[PDB]
Amino acid sequence: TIKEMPQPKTFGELKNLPLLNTDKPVQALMKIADELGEIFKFEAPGRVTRYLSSQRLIKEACDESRFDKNLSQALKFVRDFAGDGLFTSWTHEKNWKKAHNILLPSFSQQAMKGYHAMMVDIAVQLVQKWERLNADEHIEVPEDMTRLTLDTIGLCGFNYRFNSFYRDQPHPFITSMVRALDEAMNKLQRANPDDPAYDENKRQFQEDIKVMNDLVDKIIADRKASGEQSDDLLTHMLNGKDPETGEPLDDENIRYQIITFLIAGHETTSGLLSFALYFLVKNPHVLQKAAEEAARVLVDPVPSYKQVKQLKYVGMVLNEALRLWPTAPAFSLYAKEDTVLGGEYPLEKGDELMVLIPQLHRDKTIWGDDVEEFRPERFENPSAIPQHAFKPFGNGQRACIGQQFALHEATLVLGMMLKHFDFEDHTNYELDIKETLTLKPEGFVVKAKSKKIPL
Ligand code: HEM
């Protein structure tokens, strides 16, 4: 069998590093994936990674007895401000298991009924903003969806109102957060700490962290001082105890959990809503089926939890957009012990594998030949889909805890947008995928004509 592992061109002691020295790394890796195939060795000075693009190989990588979540380099950087939150912890860290056991039931589909009203609040603010645009103004899709997701996570997370729909300049926290994330991403493509970065950046970085730590800390302190019982994630963490040690979460970890909900949930969820709208506006017939379902189900001024769950086709639209462009493009895994992958490629204990989600979703072997086409119908019968072929939310006990939250919000919002407006792609937008920790359609603009249905 073809057992030797290919590799892209190298640049001496710099190795393949220069290969991703671009503002669109994942998309570049996808090209390399097309050329080299379902697996290639990517080497850097003191780091080797193996990228997987096949369902054949990836279903083996998802075997939890052989592979576990690895903290990629980027995640290690993000750990400087996200600490030991669910997202940047090792599976073997005690605070990971603890937070995971306590928070698991609060993120179930059943628990969404408690967060529903808060999600509806921000969703109505979005509709009303659009309702009030003068007919000649347009919509900055990614920009509004991000305001929508940040405010929703803030309300549901710690009952705080960032009030993004009342300002051009975001709340200072949000600003320090995007800035810290930026720095963490730039550190990844740093030639070395002195090309680019110097004391000025690190200083700025440590500053943003204080702005974040200060706000969350204060809020935690104020709540346990007043003893308030709201329906947000913070209440659940203050009154929660792990069924295993009987221990509760510490105030520092609770802080990291909140910061983690923000950094891990806002861009991914905003990207999702933007892409779905993009494919819908580019595919008039799909938009027509969706719009019709929305008008048929959402027969009340404000959507009920029950009604959101009936938006069957809309859900299919979201899943198809998640197939084509998973907003969180990759996750890393490490070999627990030595093994051979796919019976061909030998792996040693500790070897890092990197799942290229966008490539996995284009596996002709699993999805057929029209993999590049946006066809929601392919998710009509989800049970007909092979195991580990569709992985937009990670794998196993380390999969996105916020999967239900994201999908419920995305469905609620998409449903409401399709009920109140007709969308016009007045600029004949050409997809431009901007990359940060996540993927998003940069510069996507549309124009919305209201159907004049009251809220
Ligand atoms: C549609 C949007 C979303 C996508 C595509 C997404 C994707 C993912 C992926 C791929 C991972 C695994 C990362 C890894 O294995 O290294 C993950 C983990 C996680 N996500 Fe999401 N996510 C989304 C929305 C959310 C939301 C709204 C929240 C926050 C409330 C959230 C919170 C988390 C957390 C905390 C983890 C870590 C779970 C653990 O390991 O214990 N995500 N997500």
Q: What is the DSSP string of 87-145?
A: GGS-TTSHHHHHHHHHHGGGGSTTTHHHHHHHHHHHHHHHHHHHHTS-BTB-EEHHHHH
Where b means 16+ CB within 10 Å and e means fewer, 158-185 reads bbbebebeeeeebbebbebbbbbbebbb
Identify the sign of the CA torsion 423, 429, 432, 436. negative
Which atom from ligand 1 is nearest to the alpha carbon of 107? 30
Closest atom of ligand 1 relative to the 272 alpha carbon: 1
Q: Is 42 helix (H, G, I), strand (E, B) or coil?
A: strand
Annotate 344-405 with DSSP letters as a single string: TEEE-TT-EEEEEHHHHTT-HHHH-S-TTS--GGGGSSGGGSPTTS--TT--GGGS-TTHHH
Distance 402 CA to ligand 1 centre (A): 6
H helices of 400-450, in order, are 403-420
Residue whose Cα lies nearest atom 41 of ligand 1: it is 86
Residue 4 gets which letter from DSSP? S
Resolution at which this structure was determined, Å: 2.0
Fold of 1-455: Cytochrome p450 (1.10.630)
- Residue located nearest, by CA, to atom 7 of ligand 1: 393
- The rounded Å distance from CA 392 to ligand 1 centre is 9
Residue 121 CA to ligand 1 centre (angstroms)? 23
Q: What's the CA gap between 201 and 191, in Å, rounded?
A: 15
Q: Which of 284, 281, 313, 286 is nearest to 297 (CA)?
A: 313
Distance 391 CA to ligand 1 centre (A): 12
Q: Indicate which residue's Cα is closest to atom 26 of ligand 1.
A: 265
Residue with CA closest to ligand 1 atom 37 = 87
Collect all residues with Cβ–Cβ distance below 8 Å to 2 and sequence separation of at least 6.
Answer: 344
Is residue 384 within 8 A of residue 316, CB to CB? The reply is: no
How many Å is the Cα radius of gyration of the chain? 22
CB 78 within 8 A of CB 88: yes
The three-state secondary structure class of 173 is helix
- Going from the Cα of 401 to the center of ligand 1, the distance in angstroms, rounded, reads 6
Task: Give me the active site residues, please.
Answer: 268, 393, 400
CA distance 269 to 290: 19
Q: How far is CA 424 from CA 264, 415, 428, 454, in A?
A: 31, 17, 9, 21
Does 115 count as an annotated binding residue?
A: no
Rounded Cα–Cα distance for residues 45 and 190 (Å): 13
DSSP 302: S
331's enclosing H/E stretch is strand 330-335
Give residues with Cβ within 8 angstroms of 157, minimum separation 6: 232, 233, 234, 258, 261, 262
Total Cβ atoms within 10 A of residue 62: 18
Residue having the nearest C-alpha atom to atom 27 of ligand 1: 265
Q: Using CA positions, which residue lies closest to atom 20 of ligand 1?
A: 400
List the one residue out of 430, 97, 414 whose CA is nearest residue 253.
97
- Parallel, antiparallel, or unpaired for β 139-140 and 67-69? unpaired
Instruction: Tell me the technique behind this structure.
Output: X-ray
Site to substitute for ligand 1 among 400, 401, 408, most atoms within 8 A of C-beta? 400
Ligand 1 atom closest to 395 (CA): 15
**Which residue, among 301, 252, 262, has the nearest Cα to 420 in the 3D structure?**
301
Find, among 57, 5, 59, the residue nearest to 36 by Cα. Answer: 5
Residue with the smallest CA separation from ligand 1 atom 40 is 398
DSSP, collapsed to helix, strand or coil, labels residue 447 as strand
The 8-class DSSP code of residue 20 comes to G
Instruction: Please state, in angstroms and rounded to a whole number, the distance separating the CA atoms of residues 347 and 49.
Output: 11
Structure tokens at 89: 């912890």
**Rounded CA separation 455/452 (Å):** 9
Report whether 400 belongs to an annotated binding site.
yes
Domain coordinates in residue numbering, the chain: 1-455
Atom number of ligand 1 nearest to Cα 100: 41
Half-sphere exposure (Cβ direction) of 97: Cα atoms closer than 13 Å: 10
Instruction: Judge contact between 278 and 431, C-beta under 8 A.
Output: yes
Distance separating alpha carbons of residues 437 and 241, to the nearest angstrom? 32
Ligand 1 center to 328 CA (angstroms): 8
* Residue 9: Cβ-neighbour burial (10 angstroms; 0-12, 13-18, 19+): exposed
Atom of ligand 1 nearest to the CA of 407: 1
Q: Phi/psi at 444 (nearest 5 deg)? A: -70, 125
Question: Which pairs with CB-CB distance under 8 Å and at least 24 residues apart come from 84-91?
Answer: 84/253, 84/256, 85/253, 85/256, 85/257, 85/259, 85/260, 86/257, 86/260, 86/401, 87/260, 87/263, 87/264, 88/260, 91/397, 91/398
Which residues does ligand 1 sit against, CB inside 6 Å?
69, 86-87, 100, 153, 260-261, 264-265, 268-269, 272, 326-328, 331, 392-394, 398, 400-402, 405-406
Cα 437 to averaged position of ligand 1 atoms, centre (Å): 12
- Which of 155, 242, 262, 268 gets mutated to test ligand 1 (max ligand atoms within 8 A of its CB)? 268
Q: Is 335 buried (19+), middle (13-18) or exposed (0-12) by CB count in 10 A?
A: buried
Farthest-apart Cα atoms in the chain, separation:
67
Q: Give the residue among 37, 4, 31, 28 at the shortest CA–CA distance from 364.
A: 37
